[PDB]
Amino acid sequence: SMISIFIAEDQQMLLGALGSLLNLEDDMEVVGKGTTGQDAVDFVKKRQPDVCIMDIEMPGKTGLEAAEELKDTGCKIIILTTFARPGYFQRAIKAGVKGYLLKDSPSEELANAIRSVMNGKRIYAPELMEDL
Template structure:
């Protein structure tokens, strides 16, 4: 029996998924959560084989949970469900050791099959989502992303420099490079572009 926990902040969708998956002879839904902190507690308590996580949840996202599972060296394998084909989300998911990355409109039979394959140690990635990364890779360097992320939080260049132990001129150069790479005209526009792609998450 494959023991799973399910995390989805929309109650109706969570209930429907749990009901459909419970109809499978070899799958048992041992916990249902509506936010990231709740599902993390369930993972620690029930030690499930697979966690099926919505990418965007209150308190902690599905990606936050995947990173915590990886950090804690938990045996629980993660499948992310998303409505977003954002390259940044996908890249972060892969770095967090996620086994499955599927769109929310995946059918229940396909999801059940994905759970079995992930349980067996295989990766299951929606082709549309994986193609999004090849078609639109992040052009920013790690340092440029860091500068952009802090700018997105409302910090001015001087404060960003202080936080990253860089000179004002160096931060300005990173910001200028990032704006150019994203084909933007202003810092605000560049932040909006990077955010929409999921590169600042």
């Protein structure tokens, strides 16, 4: 009924803003918040949320490294980034991320990607593909 979300984002202001933006949805719930890749691995393996919103660049373990450790859990991982760095896209796919979006994408589109991913779809931003 209600989609359980874990958010991993090292920048506290953004972490808080994302949680607030997603808690505004009727069919969604932020069940945990983290600032490192390890926080994501620990919560997802233990609490098993439906979805994990994962930042890439975080201290300790990156979101891509966290995504690799969670490749065979049943959690649907959506990556968020600001800049498309080379090979992040291929590493994301190979880790089995279900979504790869821009942080600054309108909030309506992030909630839509969470629903689409829960419906078995893979949502990749065209900007983040390494062909325009």
